[PDB]
Structure 1
């Protein structure tokens, strides 16, 4: 399809790569990185997102993350 984006996938990916550079800048361990990133996610909720939407975004964010992991699982892409 045709999706014109102000924030192109190149922009997004480079933004992600840049915050990864921040993590690697101090090469924080996964445990500590998950802590920092996790609080940064909630940070955006408590900052930009009003409480009623704060719930909705949290749930969809969870489904997004969970199904991203459930995507690389694949396992025959059926059940059997």
Structure 2
């Protein structure tokens, strides 16, 4: 329900950017990016206790679909 503000947003978006930098440094393809990122995500989720391990990945995948569909929400 509430989006936790545990960390500085600047830092959050910066890390996102630095990750994108890696992807643009190699000029990776969409397929490649998804495959590399997917393994990175899974690695982190494996470090999360099993009790919530299935929950965190599901919420991840759920929210992922939410953000993708909101790109043409009220734009052309």
> What TM-score does the superposition give when structure 1 sets the normalisation length?
0.77
Structure 2 residue runs without a partner (length 5+): none
> What TM-score does the superposition give when structure 2 sets the normalisation length?
0.80
- Aligned Cα RMSD in Å? 2.1
Q: Alpha-carbon deviation of 1:20?
A: 0.7
More helix by percentage = 1
Give the Cα–Cα distance (whole angstroms) in 2 for the partners of residues 73 and 60 of structure 1: 22
The structure showing larger relative contact order (alpha-carbon pairs under 8 Å, at least 6 residues apart) is 2
1:59 equivalent in alignment to 2:26: no
Report which of the two structures shows the higher radius of gyration computed on alpha carbons: 1
Q: Helix, strand or coil for the counterpart of 1:74?
A: coil
1:11 equivalent in alignment to 2:11: yes
Which whole-Å deviations, capped at 9, do the CAs of 1:44-77 have from their partners, x for residues lacking one?
011x2011211000111111101112222437xx
**Residue 71 of structure 1: aligned partner:** 70
Corresponding pairs, count: 72
Structure 1 residue runs without a partner (length 5+): 76-80
